[PDB]
Amino acid sequence: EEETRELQSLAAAVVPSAQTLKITDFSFSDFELSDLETALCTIRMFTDLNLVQNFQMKHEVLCRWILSVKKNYRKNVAYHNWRHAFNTAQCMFAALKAGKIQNKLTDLEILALLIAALSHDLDHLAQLYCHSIMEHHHFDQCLMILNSPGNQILSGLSIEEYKTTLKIIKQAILATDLALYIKRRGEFFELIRKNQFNLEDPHQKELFLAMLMTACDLSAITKPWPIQQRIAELVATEFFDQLMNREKKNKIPSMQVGFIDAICLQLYEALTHVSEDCFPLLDGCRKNRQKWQALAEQQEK
Ligand SMILES: [Zn+2]
């Protein structure tokens, strides 16, 4: 059978180091990786964030949980598929490690952010464009998988830990609603532009976690040019086809420039003020805007 065999492969595979897998890099791709390789990357993320050891996760249970999440993504359009969710999680790991946000967060927050990044597009006919203000995410399928026999990666948590973790997971998944990002970001941007931003209070914490989910969710926009151009083209094709191709391709530069200006640039600027080591996300976003703008101008002939 398909199910049992995937598990055996994964559980008995050597998990290469973070270094070897390049998951600490903001520039990380995934294009060339197999699903099994992404699963090994995911085990490494849980491991190097100390989640497996601090919460007593059983190896085979973690493997089964990863494989159940991937399986439940099967019917999704490609831009809300397992690879997107995996990329969102890798950006979170990179932001925690290279971007040094790990020191600013608790173990429960880190655990929930990783699980949310991985689960946020599990939603259970025309589909909305990627990151539309009209999308609304749900946590129901994430929780169902977490509570499923053999998949209970939170079994090691005390009841109080468990209830708090679920609350943060729900908030973090709901944070990927772009409408909620747009609604709340003004308060974030104002606290920072002044210098009043403070991780101390429950509220400014929840808000920072939400801005970080958004920053990871949109992070294809920060990638080196050949990766961003590729993703954007694929994403566009996935929506527009759900002189034909010319009409499609000619829209894309102005789409991306508009999205960077309205949504992305200010967020990665704000993130960089919280942690200067998240600078490469901003830099990459700025370089892609330059590249798409030159294409928008050259397409006007
Ligand atoms: Zn997403």
Coordinates of C-alpha atoms and ligand atoms in Angstrom, one line a residue:
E1 CA 0.0 0.0 0.0
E2 CA 1.0 3.7 -0.5
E3 CA 0.4 4.7 3.1
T4 CA 2.5 2.3 5.1
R5 CA 5.5 2.4 2.7
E6 CA 5.9 6.2 2.8
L7 CA 6.2 6.0 6.6
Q8 CA 8.9 3.3 6.6
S9 CA 11.0 5.3 4.2
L10 CA 10.7 8.4 6.2
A11 CA 11.2 7.0 9.7
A12 CA 14.3 5.0 8.8
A13 CA 15.9 7.7 6.7
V14 CA 18.9 9.6 8.0
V15 CA 17.9 13.2 8.7
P16 CA 20.7 15.3 7.3
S17 CA 21.9 18.4 9.2
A18 CA 20.4 21.8 8.9
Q19 CA 23.6 22.9 7.2
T20 CA 23.5 20.2 4.5
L21 CA 19.8 20.8 3.8
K22 CA 20.3 24.6 3.5
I23 CA 17.1 25.3 5.5
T24 CA 18.7 28.1 7.5
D25 CA 19.0 30.2 4.3
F26 CA 16.4 32.8 3.5
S27 CA 17.3 32.0 -0.2
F28 CA 16.2 28.4 0.1
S29 CA 14.3 27.0 -2.9
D30 CA 12.6 23.5 -2.8
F31 CA 12.0 23.3 -6.6
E32 CA 14.4 20.3 -7.0
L33 CA 13.4 18.4 -3.8
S34 CA 11.3 15.3 -3.6
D35 CA 8.4 15.1 -1.1
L36 CA 10.5 12.8 1.0
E37 CA 13.3 15.4 1.1
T38 CA 10.8 18.1 2.2
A39 CA 9.7 15.8 5.0
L40 CA 13.3 15.3 6.1
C41 CA 13.7 19.0 6.1
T42 CA 10.6 19.3 8.2
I43 CA 12.0 16.8 10.8
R44 CA 15.2 18.8 10.9
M45 CA 13.2 22.1 11.6
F46 CA 11.4 20.5 14.6
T47 CA 14.7 19.0 15.8
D48 CA 17.0 22.1 15.6
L49 CA 14.3 24.3 17.2
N50 CA 14.6 21.8 20.1
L51 CA 10.9 20.9 19.7
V52 CA 11.3 17.1 19.5
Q53 CA 13.4 17.0 22.6
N54 CA 11.8 19.7 24.8
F55 CA 8.3 18.2 24.1
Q56 CA 9.2 14.5 24.0
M57 CA 7.9 13.9 20.4
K58 CA 8.2 10.3 19.3
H59 CA 10.1 10.0 16.1
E60 CA 7.6 7.8 14.3
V61 CA 4.7 9.9 15.5
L62 CA 6.3 13.1 14.1
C63 CA 6.9 11.2 10.8
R64 CA 3.3 10.1 10.6
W65 CA 2.0 13.6 11.4
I66 CA 4.2 15.2 8.7
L67 CA 2.9 12.5 6.2
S68 CA -0.7 13.0 7.2
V69 CA -0.4 16.8 6.7
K70 CA 1.1 16.3 3.3
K71 CA -1.6 13.8 2.4
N72 CA -4.4 16.2 3.4
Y73 CA -2.9 18.8 1.0
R74 CA -3.4 16.5 -2.0
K75 CA -6.6 18.0 -3.4
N76 CA -5.5 21.6 -3.0
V77 CA -4.5 23.9 -5.9
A78 CA -0.7 24.1 -6.3
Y79 CA -0.4 27.5 -4.7
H80 CA -2.1 26.2 -1.5
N81 CA -0.4 22.8 -1.6
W82 CA 2.1 21.1 0.6
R83 CA 5.1 22.8 -1.1
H84 CA 3.7 26.2 -0.3
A85 CA 3.1 25.3 3.3
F86 CA 6.5 23.7 3.6
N87 CA 8.1 26.9 2.2
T88 CA 6.2 29.0 4.7
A89 CA 7.6 26.8 7.6
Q90 CA 11.1 26.9 6.2
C91 CA 10.9 30.7 6.1
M92 CA 9.8 30.6 9.8
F93 CA 12.8 28.4 10.6
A94 CA 15.1 30.8 8.8
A95 CA 13.6 33.8 10.5
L96 CA 14.0 32.1 13.9
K97 CA 17.6 31.1 13.2
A98 CA 19.4 33.4 10.7
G99 CA 16.9 36.2 11.6
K100 CA 17.5 35.6 15.3
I101 CA 13.8 35.8 16.3
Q102 CA 14.2 32.5 18.2
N103 CA 15.6 34.4 21.3
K104 CA 12.5 36.7 21.3
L105 CA 9.9 33.9 21.5
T106 CA 9.0 31.0 23.9
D107 CA 9.0 27.3 23.1
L108 CA 5.2 27.2 23.0
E109 CA 5.2 30.1 20.5
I110 CA 7.8 28.5 18.3
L111 CA 6.0 25.1 18.4
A112 CA 2.7 26.7 17.4
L113 CA 4.2 28.9 14.7
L114 CA 5.8 25.9 13.0
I115 CA 2.7 23.8 13.2
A116 CA 0.5 26.8 11.9
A117 CA 2.9 27.5 9.0
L118 CA 2.7 23.9 8.0
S119 CA -1.1 23.6 8.5
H120 CA -2.6 27.0 7.5
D121 CA -3.9 26.0 4.0
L122 CA -5.7 22.8 5.2
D123 CA -9.3 24.1 4.8
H124 CA -11.9 21.3 5.0
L125 CA -15.3 25.7 -7.2
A126 CA -13.2 28.5 -8.9
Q127 CA -10.3 29.4 -6.5
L128 CA -9.3 32.9 -5.5
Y129 CA -5.9 34.2 -6.5
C130 CA -3.0 33.5 -4.1
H131 CA -3.2 35.7 -1.0
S132 CA -6.5 37.3 -1.8
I133 CA -8.1 39.5 0.8
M134 CA -11.2 37.3 0.4
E135 CA -9.5 34.1 1.7
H136 CA -10.4 32.8 5.1
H137 CA -8.4 30.1 6.7
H138 CA -9.6 27.6 9.3
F139 CA -7.9 25.6 12.0
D140 CA -10.4 22.7 12.1
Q141 CA -8.4 20.3 9.9
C142 CA -5.1 21.2 11.6
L143 CA -6.6 20.2 15.0
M144 CA -8.3 17.0 13.6
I145 CA -4.9 15.7 12.3
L146 CA -3.1 16.7 15.6
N147 CA -5.6 14.6 17.6
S148 CA -5.6 11.6 15.2
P149 CA -4.3 8.2 16.5
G150 CA -0.6 7.9 15.9
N151 CA -0.3 11.6 14.8
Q152 CA -0.4 13.2 18.3
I153 CA 2.8 15.2 18.3
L154 CA 1.6 17.3 21.3
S155 CA 1.0 14.2 23.5
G156 CA 4.1 15.1 25.7
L157 CA 2.5 18.5 26.6
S158 CA 0.7 19.1 29.9
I159 CA -3.0 20.0 29.5
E160 CA -2.1 23.7 30.2
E161 CA 0.7 23.7 27.6
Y162 CA -1.6 22.0 25.2
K163 CA -4.5 24.4 25.6
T164 CA -2.1 27.4 25.2
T165 CA -0.4 25.9 22.1
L166 CA -3.8 25.3 20.4
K167 CA -4.8 28.9 21.1
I168 CA -1.6 30.2 19.5
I169 CA -1.9 27.8 16.5
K170 CA -5.5 29.0 15.9
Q171 CA -4.5 32.7 16.1
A172 CA -1.5 32.1 13.8
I173 CA -3.5 30.3 11.1
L174 CA -6.2 33.0 11.2
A175 CA -3.3 35.5 10.9
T176 CA -2.7 34.3 7.3
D177 CA -6.0 35.9 6.3
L178 CA -4.6 38.9 4.5
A179 CA -7.6 41.0 5.5
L180 CA -6.6 40.6 9.1
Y181 CA -3.0 41.6 8.3
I182 CA -4.2 44.7 6.6
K183 CA -6.6 45.5 9.4
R184 CA -4.0 45.2 12.2
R185 CA -0.7 46.2 10.6
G186 CA -1.2 50.0 11.2
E187 CA -1.0 49.5 15.0
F188 CA 2.3 47.5 14.5
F189 CA 3.8 49.9 12.1
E190 CA 3.0 52.9 14.4
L191 CA 4.4 51.2 17.5
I192 CA 7.7 50.6 15.7
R193 CA 8.0 54.0 13.8
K194 CA 7.8 55.5 17.2
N195 CA 9.8 53.2 19.6
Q196 CA 7.1 51.8 21.8
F197 CA 7.1 48.2 20.4
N198 CA 7.2 45.8 23.3
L199 CA 7.1 42.0 23.3
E200 CA 6.1 42.0 27.0
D201 CA 2.3 42.5 26.7
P202 CA 0.1 39.6 25.6
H203 CA -1.4 41.9 22.9
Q204 CA 1.7 43.2 21.2
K205 CA 3.0 39.6 21.3
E206 CA 0.0 38.1 19.6
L207 CA 0.3 40.9 17.0
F208 CA 4.0 40.2 16.4
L209 CA 3.3 36.5 15.9
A210 CA 0.7 37.5 13.3
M211 CA 3.0 39.8 11.4
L212 CA 5.6 37.0 11.3
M213 CA 3.1 34.5 9.9
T214 CA 2.3 37.0 7.2
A215 CA 6.0 37.7 6.5
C216 CA 6.7 33.9 6.1
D217 CA 3.5 33.3 4.1
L218 CA 4.4 36.0 1.5
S219 CA 8.1 35.2 1.4
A220 CA 8.2 33.9 -2.2
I221 CA 8.3 37.6 -2.9
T222 CA 11.8 37.9 -1.2
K223 CA 13.5 35.1 -3.1
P224 CA 16.4 35.5 -5.6
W225 CA 15.0 36.7 -8.9
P226 CA 15.0 33.4 -10.9
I227 CA 13.0 31.7 -8.1
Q228 CA 10.5 34.5 -7.6
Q229 CA 10.0 34.9 -11.4
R230 CA 9.3 31.2 -11.7
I231 CA 6.9 31.0 -8.7
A232 CA 5.0 34.0 -9.8
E233 CA 4.6 32.6 -13.3
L234 CA 3.4 29.2 -12.0
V235 CA 1.0 30.8 -9.5
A236 CA -0.3 33.0 -12.3
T237 CA -0.8 30.0 -14.6
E238 CA -2.5 28.1 -11.9
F239 CA -5.1 30.8 -11.4
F240 CA -5.6 32.2 -14.9
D241 CA -5.9 28.7 -16.5
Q242 CA -7.9 26.9 -13.7
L243 CA -2.0 35.0 -27.4
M244 CA -3.5 33.2 -24.3
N245 CA -0.1 33.1 -22.6
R246 CA 1.1 36.5 -23.7
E247 CA -2.0 38.2 -22.2
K248 CA -1.2 36.3 -18.9
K249 CA 2.5 37.1 -18.8
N250 CA 2.0 40.8 -19.5
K251 CA -0.2 41.2 -16.4
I252 CA 2.4 39.7 -14.0
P253 CA 5.0 42.6 -13.5
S254 CA 2.3 45.2 -12.6
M255 CA 0.6 42.6 -10.3
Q256 CA 3.8 41.9 -8.4
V257 CA 4.9 45.5 -8.2
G258 CA 1.4 46.5 -6.9
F259 CA 1.5 43.7 -4.3
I260 CA 5.0 44.6 -3.1
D261 CA 4.0 48.3 -2.7
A262 CA 0.7 47.8 -1.0
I263 CA 1.4 44.7 1.1
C264 CA 5.0 43.5 1.3
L265 CA 7.6 46.3 1.5
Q266 CA 6.3 47.9 4.7
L267 CA 6.1 44.5 6.5
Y268 CA 9.7 43.5 5.8
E269 CA 10.8 47.0 6.7
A270 CA 9.0 46.7 10.0
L271 CA 10.4 43.2 10.6
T272 CA 13.9 44.4 10.0
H273 CA 13.5 47.0 12.7
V274 CA 12.5 44.3 15.2
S275 CA 15.5 42.1 14.0
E276 CA 18.1 43.5 11.8
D277 CA 19.1 40.0 10.8
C278 CA 15.8 39.7 8.9
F279 CA 17.3 42.3 6.5
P280 CA 17.7 39.8 3.6
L281 CA 13.9 39.4 3.3
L282 CA 13.6 43.2 2.8
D283 CA 16.6 43.3 0.5
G284 CA 15.2 40.5 -1.7
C285 CA 11.8 42.1 -1.8
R286 CA 13.4 45.4 -3.0
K287 CA 15.5 43.7 -5.6
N288 CA 12.4 41.8 -7.0
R289 CA 10.4 45.1 -7.2
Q290 CA 13.3 46.6 -9.2
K291 CA 13.3 43.6 -11.6
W292 CA 9.5 43.5 -12.0
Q293 CA 9.3 47.3 -12.5
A294 CA 11.9 47.1 -15.3
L295 CA 9.8 44.4 -16.9
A296 CA 6.6 46.5 -16.6
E297 CA 8.3 49.4 -18.3
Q298 CA 9.9 47.3 -21.0
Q299 CA 6.5 45.7 -21.7
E300 CA 5.0 49.2 -22.4
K301 CA 7.7 49.3 -25.2
Ligands
ZN1 ZN 0.0 30.5 2.7

